[PDB]
Amino acid sequence: AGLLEGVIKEKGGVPVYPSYLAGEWGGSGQEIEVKSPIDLATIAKVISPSREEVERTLDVLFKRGRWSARDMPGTERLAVLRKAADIIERNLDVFAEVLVMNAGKPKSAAVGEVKAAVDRLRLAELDLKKIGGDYIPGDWTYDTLETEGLVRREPLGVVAAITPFNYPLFDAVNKITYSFIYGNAVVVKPSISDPLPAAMAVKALLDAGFPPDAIALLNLPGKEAEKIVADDRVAAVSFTGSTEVGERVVKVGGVKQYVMELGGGDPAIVLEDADLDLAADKIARGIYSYAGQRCDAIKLVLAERPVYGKLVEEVAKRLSSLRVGDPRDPTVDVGPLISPSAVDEMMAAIEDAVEKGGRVLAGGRRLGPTYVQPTFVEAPADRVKDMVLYKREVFAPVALAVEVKDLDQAIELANGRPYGLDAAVFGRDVVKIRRAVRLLEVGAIYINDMPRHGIGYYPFGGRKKSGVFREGIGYAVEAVTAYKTIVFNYKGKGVWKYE
Amino acid sequence: AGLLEGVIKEKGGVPVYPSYLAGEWGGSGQEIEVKSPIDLATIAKVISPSREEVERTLDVLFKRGRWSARDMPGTERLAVLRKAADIIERNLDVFAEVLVMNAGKPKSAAVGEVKAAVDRLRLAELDLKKIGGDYIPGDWTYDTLETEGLVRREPLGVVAAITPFNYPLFDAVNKITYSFIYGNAVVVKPSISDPLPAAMAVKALLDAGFPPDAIALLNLPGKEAEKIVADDRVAAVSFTGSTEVGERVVKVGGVKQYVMELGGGDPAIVLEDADLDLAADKIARGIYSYAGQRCDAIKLVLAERPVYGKLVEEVAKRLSSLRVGDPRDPTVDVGPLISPSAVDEMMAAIEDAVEKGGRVLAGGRRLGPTYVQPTFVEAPADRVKDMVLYKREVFAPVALAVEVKDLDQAIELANGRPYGLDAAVFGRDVVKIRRAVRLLEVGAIYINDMPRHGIGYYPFGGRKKSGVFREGIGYAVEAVTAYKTIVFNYKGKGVWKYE
Amino acid sequence: AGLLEGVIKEKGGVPVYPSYLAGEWGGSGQEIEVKSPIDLATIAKVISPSREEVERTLDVLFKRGRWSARDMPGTERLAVLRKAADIIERNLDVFAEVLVMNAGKPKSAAVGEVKAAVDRLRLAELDLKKIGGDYIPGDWTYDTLETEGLVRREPLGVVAAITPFNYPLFDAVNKITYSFIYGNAVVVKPSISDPLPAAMAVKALLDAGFPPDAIALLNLPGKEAEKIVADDRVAAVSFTGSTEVGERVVKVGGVKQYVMELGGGDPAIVLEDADLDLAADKIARGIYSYAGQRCDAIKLVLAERPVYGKLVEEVAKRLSSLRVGDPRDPTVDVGPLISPSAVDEMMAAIEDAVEKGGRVLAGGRRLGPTYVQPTFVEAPADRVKDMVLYKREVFAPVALAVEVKDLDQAIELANGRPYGLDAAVFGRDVVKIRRAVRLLEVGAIYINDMPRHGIGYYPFGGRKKSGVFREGIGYAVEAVTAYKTIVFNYKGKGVWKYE
Amino acid sequence: AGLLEGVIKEKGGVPVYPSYLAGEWGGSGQEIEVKSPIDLATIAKVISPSREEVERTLDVLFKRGRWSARDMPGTERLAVLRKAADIIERNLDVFAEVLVMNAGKPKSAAVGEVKAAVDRLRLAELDLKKIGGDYIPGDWTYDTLETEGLVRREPLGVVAAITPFNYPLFDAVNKITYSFIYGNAVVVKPSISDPLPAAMAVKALLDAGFPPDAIALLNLPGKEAEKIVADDRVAAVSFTGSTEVGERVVKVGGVKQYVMELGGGDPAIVLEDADLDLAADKIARGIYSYAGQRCDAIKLVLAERPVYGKLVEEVAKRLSSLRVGDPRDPTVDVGPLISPSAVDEMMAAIEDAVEKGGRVLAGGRRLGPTYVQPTFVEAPADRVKDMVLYKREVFAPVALAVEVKDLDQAIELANGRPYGLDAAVFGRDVVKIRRAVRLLEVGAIYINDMPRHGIGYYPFGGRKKSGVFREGIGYAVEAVTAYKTIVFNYKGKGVWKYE
Ligand SMILES: NC(=O)c1ccc[n+]([C@@H]2O[C@H](COP(=O)([O-])OP(=O)(O)OC[C@H]3O[C@@H](n4cnc5c(N)ncnc54)[C@H](OP(=O)(O)O)[C@@H]3O)[C@@H](O)[C@H]2O)c1
Ligand code: NA
Ligand code: NA
Ligand code: NA
Ligand code: NA
């Protein structure tokens, strides 16, 4: 259809999306159904590549792709990304519709993601703020006298971009952009759950001029991807997903450069001097956006005694006034969760909190196989730590509320989860804020706002179980680039006169 | 003895070195013999820690060490490292003697390593050139308007420093220095082959004021160390060693920050316009230094036809005039190899080259279980690629010599090995040099000098099978530090007026 | 006409260009004739502002302009510059025609300048590579313990951009771009000799959305501009012009931030191993481009004995084959010099060289009041230093040729002029090149190419009499921005625990 | 005496200090008396150089000094500065005594300045955080394809360091250190008022190994120094002093690189949520330290209505409890002002404030020709702006106190003075603090502390009448260094393949 006109194959009434094998769209592997969480119906099929096609694709990426990407000057790479942005932008409605149907994303959120993808592509020139190399004079040590160094970055070669289901379009475009801008070839491996947006993005890139042998899109399910990760032709792996899969990926990959964005949720702290209107609004939104299916979703709210009552009151009201059900209605605030399993886990998690002294302050009602109300569970500090909702990341619209004596207890409870992605702090006192900033063990802290990675204007990434390394405009250069040092020796050659 | 007076325990006529358990020297595990390659005799014993002591040590490092190191202000950390430098310097002869006896290192090389360790410690202030964070204004995007970012570095926590046998003193001091200067606690795991120098360095650091609960020295053999690497309290692993072990380390460690310096040898290219006197001298030295037991040792020499004859002639003469045997004589140029196995492998490798058309131009004679002559094997370009000396790193004083038609063939053969640590290029033409620099796939290129990492004044590290990431003054901050982003939200707060 | 439709006033058959007074185009001062060097005819008139209008303009720029520019977020400033680029691009022929007629620039050179202006505007996002601030931790000194610093850039306010005649369009657009991208208001003061292109550029910027009260274009002759420079509301002065005027500007301005690009010519050195075809081509072009009316024009050629003959032979041939006369013909290689005076000076300078032992190798013939042939004058090393062509910058297509014994003499003669803008070195030996690079006292050295600032992709600027500070993408931030340091004190506040 | 044993010449009972003429201590110019503000007695004499000696000194600095400094490798420069630190440190009491006697500085302050000088010297290695150059790849523009750039810093040559009377030791050592660490020669021109400490510092540097022909110390009074500033061999001028003299210096110097630290006082703002104990303490100290003879002294206190009463009450008490009189007593809090004139001006300024509605809250009594009590004058917001104490910098221990309605009025009044050096803000609310930070027009803002430049750990400098450019560890590289760009051309040379 338009963008994917000659690519998609209507077979048996259901559109069949092929993989892109670094040159031609195709695939001879098993076909796999792709369903919508809105009605559990099959909306398309994707053709996975065969072992032989995976092998051939990697061979093309390694032997030719690395050079096609590297030998396309930066000035053209930029033109490619900008053109791709234009193509995605003019196909906005189509990109959004697929996000709504395939991911169950509310219309406004789907439109927001497409626009993030477009902006990420257009701002590729900002990534150059970290591209320059270093010139190191040698006269600061006797052994390096009359010597000199140049340190420059080089692309690693083939980057494997593995993406999650919750940001099927942005994550693929983001990783492709930063991997490509520095001269790398890329193998994209999207969630087999909602791989359609990536296929659409890759086509837009190909139409825009992206070297055809420098990119690949493989519709491989879970462990079928290990094959790519473990291959020596893959110099780097950019992975966004769960802690457990991330661990498996590194153990399969071995020595390579990695960026591991492993999520988990985020805690939000509200100090007694906080603007409770701003806090309640931002916290409610951080809890329910995209039905809590956000790595930076708020999963725990900690509020100092003097504001805990009002704060939790306001958040409860806001969550209760939300409208759930089918995401197409520009009226719905919350669509479905990606699978009935995800809802099952949320319900069980809520029961666990209740059995351990927790009390539901809002929501709690399952509305269908993939529908549930955003839930806010109050818990006493002395018991919250043993609750599943605390110890784990329940990927759903659910957060715990805990009253705390002071900042130290807030910080202590916030750091008590095994994760350390982001944290939020609402308050105004510079000293308490500076203290929280120093002691919260997370990759990023949001002062007076809900955690939101956006397009990575500010770098983000994990600590503890949330992973290692960062993504962000400019900063991602560290994950897909290697340094090259050139040491020039002029010892006794008369350039310098003892210096 | 002096430095290790109350630490070393003379038991059964052989000095017994205990492990340092983040607080007290001790150990209840198996005792292990430490031998000299000079005479295969046992010169000491080291006490390995028990599982329980490993567990307790990690617990101390994690619960207290991270904070002792982090809460010691940088100004004191620097004083600690400087004081340690003074202590090692005044104990120079003792440090050197142990290197000579334990590692079989020629006196001058042993003295050189101690001085490198001392300088590395004293120049810790230079590591600060990469410590500052970034302030990111938010008005360059509409979504971040009235927003602002601060990105600063933080220590990761506990860094596991795993070191090889060939630089038993420097590698431990280097990793400790860059890990500690940024606020990390450190677990050192030296080669069980020559762990004595590390014990001496750690004691000097402790005497200098290094927080006692922030450092540990565990004498664990090979796979006993996996226990440390795989532990969640270990946030980073700095490993210098072989490709194969490095792979195992990552597969055991899983997600963490890694610096993998995996060696392999280096190729040296000589262009027709090169100063052949300089080239022959530097290349000969790169081949035999420390009996080729250097990750940056020259293992392949490629010379353009018009200079190949003279060049190879000169290098052969130089290697032949070398004096082998016991390293104590300030007369000996080459001491023994670390083990009889290493020599066996070298001899077999030489036979392989010969059976495949290779011709010995210098050396070739084994002089004892751990002694051999520096060898230079000529090989025709059409057969060298299948030789063990080419396909593998034979850790010994042996290199291949190959005549080539031109630069492209030189580059092609240089890149043909599975490694990519450093490469050397001797010549004067800027264009040919720039071309080689762009196309040699290695972490570092040395123009008109043999490859020499020194103390890391210039960053170095691998490509391909030689690993990932870099070590160097300043640059090592990337391996033992994590970024922390703080996003401040002032939306609608009146700080800015639409900007 | 189109772009300047309602701005230009046809009065007495000659188009009258008004000044832009930070809000409205106008002027009540003396009217001044603008002539073409192609035929000495009056092609337009410009209205200079009255003292009162200068005062009022500065008042608007200071009281409102600083804030209009600063309060327009960077994201919009960028959109403004990009839109201006589009407007200039679609009006390319018109912009070029005026450059050809007003500056006497050959068509291709005029087209080249317009395109440079367009690209400079479009690449404003690259200027951000130097916009970020610094975060300075305080624990590296005892006195700053529990303290912390943030260093960010801020616009200075009102930047006075004073431009020369030889790049009437680019220089104005360049200075405006880097001054505006960081948040400054700008007063442009173009050469009263060819102020038309600036008027056209400013209009394009205004049409593009440039805050109307944040920019001004004042058609003031020479010393009438001192009034602007000396004013306290002008925080910076970006000046490109002659050494003598630059000196006067600083002496009138007093304490302020300055960028002084004071030209002078450039020497070119040819080593014995140089590609003489490349060298002859580039050197000939550096001598005659835009009739030598380029600050980076080659004014002295120094060649080692073994190549001097051929080199100078080839350059002479190339200069002789040039076609002079009226710049409209896409056939002409060289148009006229800006004024008959400039030609007079060139002729006198040639006579001086001849009277002192110099010999004309090419050109020498004046072809009219403003026309002359590109001239190449040979001179013996022992007499060249006293020649006007050496001691001074003769802004015309004329260069000296001097044979030298070796590199040291080349370097010595190159450094003998009172200028130090750029220098060129053709050769291949890295050591000789590195030596020349270290010893040539100039802001920039071009290896194997003629000196060419282009759009400042690489920073450039002077040494010695050629001025101070640099212009260039990114680097110009230093001239139009000031640092702001914020020191936070948390002494004894419990953020840190002794560190 | 010891340090200056063979240098000082006891003549007529009064020690005579000669100038240092870049090689030998001497001087044939007029002798000038140096007096103590403690008793107006002559304590020494300094020999000014003759015109001929000034000329010869500059000739030595230019022809040999530039090279002696530049050709001494950085590693030795550092050793020189460190050794000088040791020499000054062991002569601490002697250095302090002279500061007490010559500058009238209280013992503790004199000891503090010597220690700042010592630390500044020892931390010269931190200045290297800004010494590295940039490597600029050329493929981000079509015109620069197959091209490449290197941008490195170079010393300017001869830096003229002109210093004020209030920090006679530190300012000279600071400027010398940052000028020398990057490879420059230096001419020091101290205040003829208290030039003794500089003579002592220069000797310590010479004894430490500072190249003898690379430094000069000229005891020239006021306008006699213009001769140095105006000379073409002086590539940069680092000046710390009054606005008026700074202006004269630039007008005499013309085009050169300048750092102008022109002082003026600083305003301090106290928000309603401020810790008034901390604020009162820090503000009182900022008002009286060294008898207000500090460029960063607090001259205006602005406090929000709800805390104004207490705050001003507390500061008054603190100022009243101070002990004035002869600085030798480790008991005295405040010594004398540098001259009776300075006190006259302060008294007249106080009368002016009183005649305009001001009321003295503390002090006001002159105690002798050079002694006065620290004074705090209350003034109504509607009249303060016309007071001399507001409009001018009265270099003495005197500040105005003004009650304000809110932050906007505080900011408005703070920005109302013609200066913009530093400002202080005491309070805790992040939003109000961020607002003040954005709107205060000064080089530096101190949050919750009095303004204190210290040794420049954090860069500082002026805005408005307070000057241009910054000094600070690292940042001063901009004032005494110039960039050198090297552009390499590989167009069509086969390094890149279209990229
Ligand atoms: N260093 C570089 O990068 C660079 C680049 C391009 C050109 N240049 C140099 O500039 C010169 C060619 O340009 P040009 O002939 O037009 O030189 P110029 O006369 O020095 O240009 C001076 C600019 O300053 C104005 N001006 C003149 N007197 C002034 C005064 N007293 N106060 C304030 N402003 C004053 C001029 O306006 P009026 O036109 O009204 O006199 C003109 O706009 C050559 O020496 C060339 O090498 C240097
Ligand atoms: Na692997
Ligand atoms: Na793990
Ligand atoms: Na002025
Ligand atoms: Na001058």
DSSP calls for A237-293? EEEES-HHHHHHHHHHH-SSEEEEE----EEEEE-TTS-HHHHHHHHHHHHHGGGG-
- The residue written with tokens 């993030």 in the block is A116
Q: Cβ contact (<8 Å) for D437 and C247?
A: no
Amino acid present at C46: V
Q: Looking at the DSSP assignment, which residues form a beta bridge with residue A334?
A: A324
Structure tokens at D18: 């000669």
Q: Cβ contact (<8 Å) for C495 and A129?
A: no
Asked if D219 contacts D225 with a C-beta cutoff of 8 angstroms, the reply is: no
**Is D261 considered catalytic here?**
yes
Structure tokens at B229: 């690497």
The annotated binding site of C for beta-D-fructose 6-phosphate is made up of 70, 77, 182
Amino acid present at C495: V
CA of D122, closest CA in chain A: separation in Å?
15
Asked if D173 contacts D204 with a C-beta cutoff of 8 angstroms, the reply is: no
Give the ranges where B137-182 is alpha helix by DSSP (H).
170-181
Structure tokens at B250: 């990552």
User: What does the domain layout of chain A look like in residue ranges?
Assistant: 14-262+467-490, 265-462
Tell me the angle at which helices C196-208 and C74-90 cross, rounded to the nearest 10 degrees: 130
Contacts of D223 (CB under 8 A, 6+ apart): none
Asked if C42 contacts C14 with a C-beta cutoff of 8 angstroms, the reply is: yes
Assess whether the C-beta atom of C262 lies below 6 angstroms from ligand 1.
yes
End-to-end Cα spacing for chain D: 68
C-alpha B301/C-alpha B426 separation (Å) is 11
- Strand pairing category for B25-26 and B19-20: antiparallel
A14-262+467-490 folds as: Aldehyde Dehydrogenase; Chain A, domain 1 (3.40.605)
Q: Which atom of ligand 1 is nearest to C245's Cα?
A: 20
Q: Looking at the DSSP assignment, which residues form a beta bridge with residue D260?
A: D239, D468
Short-list C411, C387, C383, C386, CA closest to C398? C387
Instruction: Using DSSP, state whether D483 is helix, strand or coil.
Output: strand
Apex CA B256: angle with CA B253 and CA B259, to 5°? 90
Whether A453 has a binding-site annotation, put simply, is: yes
Residues of chain C contacting B497 with CB distance shorter than 8 Å: 67, 71
Judge whether C490 is closer than 8 Å to chain A, CB to CB: yes
Q: Looking at the DSSP assignment, which residues form a beta bridge with residue C14?
A: C11
Q: Looking at the DSSP assignment, which residues form a beta bridge with residue D483?
A: D153
Whether A31 has a binding-site annotation, put simply, is: no
Half-sphere exposure of B29 (CA within 13 A, CB side): 25
Judge whether B150 is closer than 8 Å to chain C, CB to CB: yes
Whether the domain at A14-262+467-490 and the domain at A265-462 fall into the same CATH topology? no
Assess whether the C-beta atom of C191 lies below 6 angstroms from ligand 1.
yes
**Other C-beta atoms lying within 10 Å of the C-beta of residue B63:** 12
Assess whether the C-beta atom of C421 lies below 6 angstroms from ligand 1.
yes
10 Å CB burial of residue A281 (0-12, 13-18, 19+) is middle
Chain C residue at shortest CA distance from B146: C73
Nearest to A73 among D73, D150, D499 (CB): D499
Reported as type and span, the H/E element at residue D158 is strand D158-162
The DSSP secondary-structure symbol of C222 reads: G
C-alpha A18/C-alpha B190 separation (Å) is 52
Judge whether A486 is closer than 8 Å to chain C, CB to CB: no
Asked if A7 contacts A98 with a C-beta cutoff of 8 angstroms, the reply is: no
Ligand nearest to the CA of C260: 1
C-alpha D286/C-alpha D265 separation (Å) is 10
**Other C-beta atoms lying within 10 Å of the C-beta of residue D253:** 24
Reported as type and span, the H/E element at residue C263 is none
The DSSP secondary-structure symbol of B397 reads: S
C-alpha A19/C-alpha B61 separation (Å) is 49
Q: In Å, what resolution does this model reach?
A: 2.3
Short-list C484, C289, C481, C319, CA closest to C395? C289
C-alpha B148/C-alpha C362 separation (Å) is 62
Short-list B422, B433, B427, B425, CA closest to B459? B422
Structure tokens at D465: 């009448």
Q: Whose CA is nearest to atom 48 of ligand 1?
A: C263
Short-list C422, C356, C367, C426, CA closest to C393? C422
C-alpha D372/C-alpha D360 separation (Å) is 14
Nearest to D444 among C141, C253, C487 (CB): C487
C-alpha D48/C-alpha C183 separation (Å) is 47
C-alpha C182/C-alpha C214 separation (Å) is 13
Asked if D246 contacts D259 with a C-beta cutoff of 8 angstroms, the reply is: no
Buried b vs exposed e over A234-260: b needs ≥16 C-beta within 10 Å?
bbbbbbbbbbebbbbbbbbbbbbbbbb
The annotated binding site of C for AMP is made up of 70, 77, 132, 152-153
Sheet holding A14-17, edge to edge: A9-11, A14-17, A42-47, A31-35
Please report, to the nearest 10 degrees, the dihedral formed by the alpha carbons of residues D90, D91, D92, D96 taken in order.
Answer: 180
Amino acid present at D150: L
Short-list A252, A248, A84, CA closest to A172? A84
The DSSP secondary-structure symbol of D12 reads: T
C-alpha B260/C-alpha B469 separation (Å) is 6
Asked if A291 contacts A442 with a C-beta cutoff of 8 angstroms, the reply is: no
Structure tokens at D337: 């002002």
Reported as type and span, the H/E element at residue D90 is helix D74-90
Q: Whose CA is nearest to atom 4 of ligand 1?
A: C263
Tell me the angle at which helices B74-90 and B107-122 cross, rounded to the nearest 10 degrees: 160
The DSSP secondary-structure symbol of A49 reads: P
DSSP for D193-261 reads: TS-HHHHHHHHHHHHHT--TTSEEE----GGGTHHHHT-TT--EEEEES-HHHHHHHHHHH-SSEEEEE
C-alpha D25/C-alpha D217 separation (Å) is 9
C-alpha B278/C-alpha B272 separation (Å) is 13
Q: Among residues D53, D224, D261, D345, which one is catalytic?
A: D261
Asked if D106 contacts D100 with a C-beta cutoff of 8 angstroms, the reply is: yes
Assess whether the C-beta atom of C272 lies below 6 angstroms from ligand 1.
no
Judge whether D145 is closer than 8 Å to chain C, CB to CB: no
Structure tokens at A474: 């400019």
Instruction: Using DSSP, state whether B451 is helix, strand or coil.
Output: coil
Structure tokens at D227: 């001769």
Reported as type and span, the H/E element at residue C33 is strand C31-35
Assess whether the C-beta atom of C163 lies below 6 angstroms from ligand 1.
yes
Judge whether C491 is closer than 8 Å to chain A, CB to CB: no
Nearest to A495 among C128, C438, C496 (CB): C438
Nearest to B498 among C73, C134, C135 (CB): C73
Short-list A279, A266, A267, CA closest to A307? A279
Short-list A238, D136, D16, CA closest to C460? D136
* Second-level CATH architecture of B265-462: 3-Layer(aba) Sandwich (3.40)
> What is the distance, to the nearest Å, from the Cα of residue B48 to the centroid of all Cα atoms in its chain?
23
Q: Cβ contact (<8 Å) for B254 and A247?
A: yes
C-alpha A307/C-alpha A292 separation (Å) is 24
Q: Cβ contact (<8 Å) for B443 and A253?
A: no
Buried b vs exposed e over A74-89: b needs ≥16 C-beta within 10 Å?
bbbbbebbbbbbebbb
Q: Cβ contact (<8 Å) for D135 and A134?
A: yes
End-to-end Cα spacing for chain A: 68
- The residue written with tokens 């772009």 in the block is C3
For CA atoms B253, B254, B255, B257, give the dihedral sign.
positive
Chain D residue at shortest CA distance from C488: D447
- The residue written with tokens 């010449």 in the block is D9
SS3 content of chain B, % helix, strand, coil (to 5): 40, 25, 35
Assess whether the C-beta atom of C103 lies below 6 angstroms from ligand 1.
no
Reported as type and span, the H/E element at residue C425 is strand C422-426
Structure tokens at D494: 């086969």
**Is B261 considered catalytic here?**
yes
End-to-end Cα spacing for chain C: 68
Contacts of D385 (CB under 8 A, 6+ apart): D391, D413, D416
Residues of chain D contacting A407 with CB distance shorter than 8 Å: none
The DSSP secondary-structure symbol of B282 reads: H
Assess whether the C-beta atom of C146 lies below 6 angstroms from ligand 1.
no
Chains that touch D (3 or more CB pairs under 8 A): A, B, C
CA of B489, closest CA in chain C: separation in Å?
16
Q: Among residues D113, D146, D224, D295, which one is catalytic?
A: D295
Give the ranges where D321-380 is alpha helix by DSSP (H).
340-355
> What is the distance, to the nearest Å, from the Cα of residue B235 to the centroid of all Cα atoms in its chain?
20
Instruction: Using DSSP, state whether D25 is helix, strand or coil.
Output: strand
DSSP for D91-141 reads: THHHHHHHHHHHH---HHHHHHHHHHHHHHHHTGGGGGGGT-EEEEESTTS
Nearest to C129 among A128, A430, A496 (CB): A128
Phi (first) and psi of residue D489, to 5 degrees: -110, 120
Short-list C187, C242, C209, C199, CA closest to C59? C187
Asked if C386 contacts C356 with a C-beta cutoff of 8 angstroms, the reply is: yes
Q: Cβ contact (<8 Å) for D490 and B434?
A: yes
C-alpha B114/C-alpha B121 separation (Å) is 11
DSSP for B306-354 reads: HHHHHHHHHHHHHHHT--BS-TTSTT-SB---S-HHHHHHHHHHHHHHH
Tell me the angle at which helices B407-415 and B430-439 cross, rounded to the nearest 10 degrees: 20
The DSSP secondary-structure symbol of A64 reads: I
Amino acid present at D190: P
Contacts of D208 (CB under 8 A, 6+ apart): D80, D81, D83, D84, D86, D87
Q: Cβ contact (<8 Å) for B444 and A123?
A: no
- Strand pairing category for C147-155 and C158-162: unpaired
Sheet holding A236-240, edge to edge: A25-26, A19-20, A215-217, A185-189, A158-162, A236-240, A257-261, A467-468
Apex CA B475: angle with CA B471 and CA B477, to 5°? 95
Structure tokens at A32: 């796999």
C-alpha B200/C-alpha B34 separation (Å) is 15
Amino acid present at B233: R
Structure tokens at D405: 């309605």
Sheet holding B9-11, edge to edge: B9-11, B14-17, B42-47, B31-35
- The residue written with tokens 């403003």 in the block is C370
Ligand 1, residues C295, C345, C455: which to mutate, most atoms within 8 A of Cβ? C295
Judge whether C40 is closer than 8 Å to chain B, CB to CB: no
Ligand nearest to the CA of D255: 5
CA of B129, closest CA in chain D: separation in Å?
4
Assess whether the C-beta atom of C469 lies below 6 angstroms from ligand 1.
no
Residues of chain D contacting C149 with CB distance shorter than 8 Å: 457-458
The DSSP secondary-structure symbol of B61 reads: I
Q: Which atom of ligand 1 is nearest to C242's Cα?
A: 20
Chain A residue at shortest CA distance from C440: A495
Helices vs strands, H then E, count in chain C = 17, 24
10 Å CB burial of residue B498 (0-12, 13-18, 19+) is exposed
Asked if C372 contacts C396 with a C-beta cutoff of 8 angstroms, the reply is: yes
Tell me the angle at which helices B74-90 and B196-208 cross, rounded to the nearest 10 degrees: 130
Contacts of D242 (CB under 8 A, 6+ apart): D164, D262, D263, D393
Q: Which atom of ligand 1 is nearest to C252's Cα?
A: 32
Judge whether C445 is closer than 8 Å to chain B, CB to CB: no
Whether A222 has a binding-site annotation, put simply, is: yes
Q: Which residues surround ligand 2, an ion (CB under 5 A)?
A: A 254
For CA atoms A389, A395, A398, A399, give the dihedral sign.
positive
Ligand 1, residues C19, C46, C162, C290: which to mutate, most atoms within 8 A of Cβ? C162
